[PDB]
Amino acid sequence: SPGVVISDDEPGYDLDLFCIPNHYAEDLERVFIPHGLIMDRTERLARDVMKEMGGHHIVALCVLKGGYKFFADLLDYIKALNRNSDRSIPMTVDFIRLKSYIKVIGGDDLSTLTGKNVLIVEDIIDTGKTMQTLLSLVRQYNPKMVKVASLLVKRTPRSYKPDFVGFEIPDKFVVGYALDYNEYFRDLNHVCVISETGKAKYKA
Amino acid sequence: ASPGVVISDDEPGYDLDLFCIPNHYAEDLERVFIPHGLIMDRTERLARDVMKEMGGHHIVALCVLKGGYKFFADLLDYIKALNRNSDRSIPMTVDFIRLKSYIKVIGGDDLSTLTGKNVLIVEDIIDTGKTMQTLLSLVRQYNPKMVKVASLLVKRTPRSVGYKPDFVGFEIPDKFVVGYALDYNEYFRDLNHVCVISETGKAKYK
Amino acid sequence: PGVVISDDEPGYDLDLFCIPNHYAEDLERVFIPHGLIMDRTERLARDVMKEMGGHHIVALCVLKGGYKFFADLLDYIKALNRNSDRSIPMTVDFIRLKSYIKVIGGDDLSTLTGKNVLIVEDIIDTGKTMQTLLSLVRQYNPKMVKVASLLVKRTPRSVGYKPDFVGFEIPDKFVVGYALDYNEYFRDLNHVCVISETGKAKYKA
Amino acid sequence: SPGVVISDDEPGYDLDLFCIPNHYAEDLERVFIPHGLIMDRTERLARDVMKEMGGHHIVALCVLKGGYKFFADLLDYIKALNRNSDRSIPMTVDFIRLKIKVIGGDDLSTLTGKNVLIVEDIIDTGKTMQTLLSLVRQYNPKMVKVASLLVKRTPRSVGYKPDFVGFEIPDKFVVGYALDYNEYFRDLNHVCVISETGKAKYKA
Ligand SMILES: Nc1nc2c(ncn2C[C@H](COCCP(=O)(O)O)COCP(=O)(O)O)c(=O)[nH]1
Ligand SMILES: Nc1nc2c(ncn2C[C@H](COCCP(=O)(O)O)COCP(=O)(O)O)c(=O)[nH]1
Ligand SMILES: Nc1nc2c(ncn2C[C@H](COCCP(=O)(O)O)COCP(=O)(O)O)c(=O)[nH]1
Ligand SMILES: Nc1nc2c(ncn2C[C@H](COCCP(=O)(O)O)COCP(=O)(O)O)c(=O)[nH]1
Ligand SMILES: [Mg+2]
Ligand SMILES: [Mg+2]
Ligand SMILES: [Mg+2]
Ligand SMILES: [Mg+2]
Structure with a gap:
C-alpha cells in the first residue's frame, strides 16, 4: 500500500475552516492534511507496525527534528495496543540527526x-x-x-x-506537524502549504 | 458564515484498509467518508465560532438524540477546553431531547x-x-x-x-451516510468514522 | 473494588489545574482530575468487553449525569473494537428516570x-x-x-x-463536575470537584 | 508554586486498576502518577508558560531522552492555546543531550x-x-x-x-513517561515504581 493518496488536483482546505496558529495566519496558503486525519492514519499504522515488527524487542529510531511528532504519536498508538491486548513487546527509543555538508x-x-x-x-x-x-x-x-x-x-x-x-x-513543499521551513512551522498542528508572504517572511 | 467543509459529489472517500475500523463492520462498510479526526478538527473550529457568537450570555445546550450525542459531547468538550484556558467564559447547562414523528x-x-x-x-x-x-x-x-x-x-x-x-x-x-452516532436501523452508532454503507451491510441490518 | 478515595483525601488546589473561568470562585478543590477519570474508564472499558463482549451489547445511558461517562466509556470500547480480531456490534439508548x-x-x-x-x-x-x-x-x-x-x-x-x-x-460527600450537577450547574466541567460555600449560595434554588 | 505535591506516604495506585503495558506486568510495583493526571497538570503548565514567555519568539529545548514525552505534550497544549487565542508567538524547537x-x-x-x-x-x-x-x-x-x-x-x-x-x-526511583531504568520503561504511559522482579530483570 502506498498509503493515503492525495492527488495533484487537491485544493486542500480553506484556512478559515480550521483552528490555525494565530501567528501563522497570513503565512499559510491552505491546510493540506488536517491533524486529525494524520492521527487516524497513524493509528492504523501502529497496528500494522506491531503486526509486522512483533514480537521481538523493538528499537525505535526518531530522525530529528521533523520526525518527532509522527514518532511520538505513533508510539502512543502502539502504547494503546500494548496496554489493551495480549501479545506485545518491550520497546526502547533513540533519537538521531542526519548530517550533510x-x-x-x-x-x-x-x-x-x-x-x-x-x-x-x-x-x-x-x-x-x-x-x-x-x-x-x-x-x-x-x-x-x-x-x-x-x-x-x-x-x-x-x-x-x-x-x-x-x-x-x-510534489509540493509542505510544512507543519514538525516539518519545517527554515526551522519555522514546526509549531503547527496540521500539515499545510506556505504562502508567498510566509516564504518571504521566514526566508533564510 | 461559511457553508462548512464542502464535500463534493465527486468525492470517492477512503479505502477501509487505510484506517482502523470496527471489526464487526468490516464487510458492512464500503468507504470511509469523513475520518473521525477530520470531524474533531472541524468541531474544534466550530467551538470557537460558537463562543464568539453565543458566549455573551448563559447557554443552554440542547442535544437532539440519538444521532446528535457524539457531536454534542465533542463540541462541548472543545468549548470547555476554551473556557478553562481563557478569561472569557460563560456558564452552560445541558438538556437532551428526542424527536418523534407522530x-x-x-x-x-x-x-x-x-x-x-x-x-x-x-x-x-x-x-x-x-x-x-x-x-x-x-x-x-x-x-x-x-x-x-x-x-x-x-x-x-x-x-x-x-x-x-x-x-x-x-x-x-445527497447520499446516505452512517457512523459518528448516525445510524442505519440503530446500527453503526458504535462507529467512530462517518462512512457509506455497503450492499452487504444494508442487507444484514435491514 | 474500584479506585478507593479515602475520607481524608484533601484533593487538589484549584490553581494547579485548568478550571472553568466562570467557576473560579465557585469551587473549593479538585477531587478527581479529568485525566484520572479517563485512565480509570480506559481499564473499565476492557473489563466490560471481557465480560460482555461475547454478545450484542445494548448500552443504556442514564441522563443526564451519565452522559460524559457514557460517551467516554464507549469511546474506549470503540478503541478496543477497531484494534481487535473479534468484536460485537453495539446499539445505544438514553433514558431519564422519574417517580410515580x-x-x-x-x-x-x-x-x-x-x-x-x-x-x-x-x-x-x-x-x-x-x-x-x-x-x-x-x-x-x-x-x-x-x-x-x-x-x-x-x-x-x-x-x-x-x-x-x-x-x-x-x-459520603457531595461532588460536582463530569456531568454531575448542582441545580443544573457544573455539568459543563470535566473535573470531578467540590463546590465552595460561595458557589453553593450562588447557585442554590 | 511547588507544583502538585506527592507525599512520602503516598502508596500510589494498584496496577490492575489501570491499563498497563502487558510486558511490564510484574516489573512494576504501583502506579505513581496516572498519565491522565500528568496531562491535566501539563495543560495548566502550558498556560503558565505562555503567560510568562509568550511575549517573544520561543525556542523550546528538549533534554533527551527522558524529557521527550513531557516536551511533546507540553508543546501540544501550548499549540492548542495558540490556535484558539487572538495572541500567540512563533516557537522553534531543538533537541539536546547533556553529558x-x-x-x-x-x-x-x-x-x-x-x-x-x-x-x-x-x-x-x-x-x-x-x-x-x-x-x-x-x-x-x-x-x-x-x-x-x-x-x-x-x-x-x-x-x-x-x-x-x-x-x-x-526521593523514590520512578520510571515511565519517557523516564527509564536502564533504557527500559520509556514505552510506558504512567509514572510508576518498579517491582523487585523488574529491577533485577533489567539490571545493567
Ligand atoms: N519540511 C519539508 N522538507 C522537505 C520537503 N521535501 C523535501 N524535504 C527535505 C527532506 C528533509 O529535510 C532535509 C534537511 P533536514 O532533515 O535537516 O530538515 C529531505 O529528505 C531526504 P531525501 O529522501 O534523500 O530527498 C517538504 O515538502 N517539506
Ligand atoms: N443516518 C442517516 N440519517 C439520515 C440521512 N439523511 C437523512 N436522514 C434522516 C435524518 C432524520 O431522520 C429521522 C429519524 P431519527 O432522527 O430518529 O434518527 C435527517 O433528518 C433531517 P430532515 O430531512 O431535514 O427532517 C443519512 O444520510 N444518514
Ligand atoms: N451531583 C451529585 N448528586 C448526588 C450525589 N449523591 C447523591 N446524588 C443524587 C443521585 C441521583 O438522584 C437524583 C439526581 P438526578 O435526577 O440528576 O440523576 C443519587 O443516586 C441514586 P441512589 O443510589 O438511589 O441514591 C452527589 O455527591 N453529587
Ligand atoms: N529515570 C530516573 N532518573 C533519575 C531519578 N532520580 C534521579 N535520576 C537521574 C537524573 C538524571 O540523571 C541520569 C542521566 P540521563 O539524563 O542520561 O538519564 C538526575 O537529574 C539531574 P540533577 O538534578 O543534576 O541531579 C529517577 O527517580 N528516575
Ligand atoms: Mg526527515
Ligand atoms: Mg438528527
Ligand atoms: Mg444517576
Ligand atoms: Mg533529565
Whole structure:
C-alpha cells in the first residue's frame, strides 16, 4: 500500500475552516492534511507496525527534528495496543540527526541496533536517497530486521519505498506537524502549504 | 458564515484498509467518508465560532438524540477546553431531547427553562430542514433570548425547504451516510468514522 | 473494588489545574482530575468487553449525569473494537428516570430481550434507584444486565447494592463536575470537584 | 508554586486498576502518577508558560531522552492555546543531550535574544540545570526558563528550583513517561515504581 493518496488536483482546505496558529495566519496558503486525519492514519499504522515488527524487542529510531511528532504519536498508538491486548513487546527509543555538508550525529552507539527489530521513523521521503544511505549504514551492524515508517512520501522524479507510509503527497513543499521551513512551522498542528508572504517572511 | 467543509459529489472517500475500523463492520462498510479526526478538527473550529457568537450570555445546550450525542459531547468538550484556558467564559447547562414523528419532543426538561436563555441546538444532520424548522417553531413559543443551531452535516439537496443552520461542520452530497452516532436501523452508532454503507451491510441490518 | 478515595483525601488546589473561568470562585478543590477519570474508564472499558463482549451489547445511558461517562466509556470500547480480531456490534439508548420507577424516553424495553445490557450511571448513593431499575429490566428477560457506575459512595444509607463496574469509591460527600450537577450547574466541567460555600449560595434554588 | 505535591506516604495506585503495558506486568510495583493526571497538570503548565514567555519568539529545548514525552505534550497544549487565542508567538524547537557539554543541538548562538524554554523530566540535585543555565546565559537570551515534570525533595539539593514544576515527588526511583531504568520503561504511559522482579530483570 502506498498509503493515503492525495492527488495533484487537491485544493486542500480553506484556512478559515480550521483552528490555525494565530501567528501563522497570513503565512499559510491552505491546510493540506488536517491533524486529525494524520492521527487516524497513524493509528492504523501502529497496528500494522506491531503486526509486522512483533514480537521481538523493538528499537525505535526518531530522525530529528521533523520526525518527532509522527514518532511520538505513533508510539502512543502502539502504547494503546500494548496496554489493551495480549501479545506485545518491550520497546526502547533513540533519537538521531542526519548530517550533510551520510553522517549520523547523536543517538546511542549503533551496536545497540545489533540483533534487534529496528523501526526508523521519518517525516518525509522525497528523493529516497537519504534512507537508502541510512539503511546501508544501519545494515552493517546486523539487526534482526530494519523497517521504515515515513509520514509522507512524495510523488516525484526520484530513486525507494518505506515499509509503512502515511500519505502519498504531490510534489509540493509542505510544512507543519514538525516539518519545517527554515526551522519555522514546526509549531503547527496540521500539515499545510506556505504562502508567498510566509516564504518571504521566514526566508533564510 | 461559511457553508462548512464542502464535500463534493465527486468525492470517492477512503479505502477501509487505510484506517482502523470496527471489526464487526468490516464487510458492512464500503468507504470511509469523513475520518473521525477530520470531524474533531472541524468541531474544534466550530467551538470557537460558537463562543464568539453565543458566549455573551448563559447557554443552554440542547442535544437532539440519538444521532446528535457524539457531536454534542465533542463540541462541548472543545468549548470547555476554551473556557478553562481563557478569561472569557460563560456558564452552560445541558438538556437532551428526542424527536418523534407522530414533530413532537419527548423526555426533556420543561421548555420554560429556555425562556430568556441562549439556546444552542445540536444536530447530527439536516436534510430537507423540515425537522429543524418544526423544532424551532416549538422552541420559539417559549421566547428564548437567542436560539442557534449547530449541525455536523448539511446535505446538498433540491429537497431542501431552504433552512440553513447557524453552524455547519460539513456540507455533504445527497447520499446516505452512517457512523459518528448516525445510524442505519440503530446500527453503526458504535462507529467512530462517518462512512457509506455497503450492499452487504444494508442487507444484514435491514 | 474500584479506585478507593479515602475520607481524608484533601484533593487538589484549584490553581494547579485548568478550571472553568466562570467557576473560579465557585469551587473549593479538585477531587478527581479529568485525566484520572479517563485512565480509570480506559481499564473499565476492557473489563466490560471481557465480560460482555461475547454478545450484542445494548448500552443504556442514564441522563443526564451519565452522559460524559457514557460517551467516554464507549469511546474506549470503540478503541478496543477497531484494534481487535473479534468484536460485537453495539446499539445505544438514553433514558431519564422519574417517580410515580418510571423510565422516560428511550426505546421499547422489548429491545433488551436476549441482549447483553449495560446500564451506565454517574453515581451510586443509596443504591435504591439501581435496585429498582434492575428489577424492571429483568422482567424483559435480557441475556445479561450489568451496571457501570463512575462513582460509588461509602455511605451508611446504602441499601446494600453494588454495581458490577466501578470507577471510584468516594467518601459520603457531595461532588460536582463530569456531568454531575448542582441545580443544573457544573455539568459543563470535566473535573470531578467540590463546590465552595460561595458557589453553593450562588447557585442554590 | 511547588507544583502538585506527592507525599512520602503516598502508596500510589494498584496496577490492575489501570491499563498497563502487558510486558511490564510484574516489573512494576504501583502506579505513581496516572498519565491522565500528568496531562491535566501539563495543560495548566502550558498556560503558565505562555503567560510568562509568550511575549517573544520561543525556542523550546528538549533534554533527551527522558524529557521527550513531557516536551511533546507540553508543546501540544501550548499549540492548542495558540490556535484558539487572538495572541500567540512563533516557537522553534531543538533537541539536546547533556553529558557542561551539550551533546547535539544547534549552535547555541541560536538562543541569543530569544525566550529559551528548557524542558526536563526530573530535577534531583539541581546541578544539571544550574550548570546548563550558567552556560546558556552566556549566549544572552532574552530570558531562559526551565520546565520540569518532576522535582525531588532531597537534602543534597543545591537549592535550585525550576520556573515550572509538574509534580513534587519524594526521593523514590520512578520510571515511565519517557523516564527509564536502564533504557527500559520509556514505552510506558504512567509514572510508576518498579517491582523487585523488574529491577533485577533489567539490571545493567
Ligand atoms: N519540511 C519539508 N522538507 C522537505 C520537503 N521535501 C523535501 N524535504 C527535505 C527532506 C528533509 O529535510 C532535509 C534537511 P533536514 O532533515 O535537516 O530538515 C529531505 O529528505 C531526504 P531525501 O529522501 O534523500 O530527498 C517538504 O515538502 N517539506
Ligand atoms: N443516518 C442517516 N440519517 C439520515 C440521512 N439523511 C437523512 N436522514 C434522516 C435524518 C432524520 O431522520 C429521522 C429519524 P431519527 O432522527 O430518529 O434518527 C435527517 O433528518 C433531517 P430532515 O430531512 O431535514 O427532517 C443519512 O444520510 N444518514
Ligand atoms: N451531583 C451529585 N448528586 C448526588 C450525589 N449523591 C447523591 N446524588 C443524587 C443521585 C441521583 O438522584 C437524583 C439526581 P438526578 O435526577 O440528576 O440523576 C443519587 O443516586 C441514586 P441512589 O443510589 O438511589 O441514591 C452527589 O455527591 N453529587
Ligand atoms: N529515570 C530516573 N532518573 C533519575 C531519578 N532520580 C534521579 N535520576 C537521574 C537524573 C538524571 O540523571 C541520569 C542521566 P540521563 O539524563 O542520561 O538519564 C538526575 O537529574 C539531574 P540533577 O538534578 O543534576 O541531579 C529517577 O527517580 N528516575
Ligand atoms: Mg526527515
Ligand atoms: Mg438528527
Ligand atoms: Mg444517576
Ligand atoms: Mg533529565
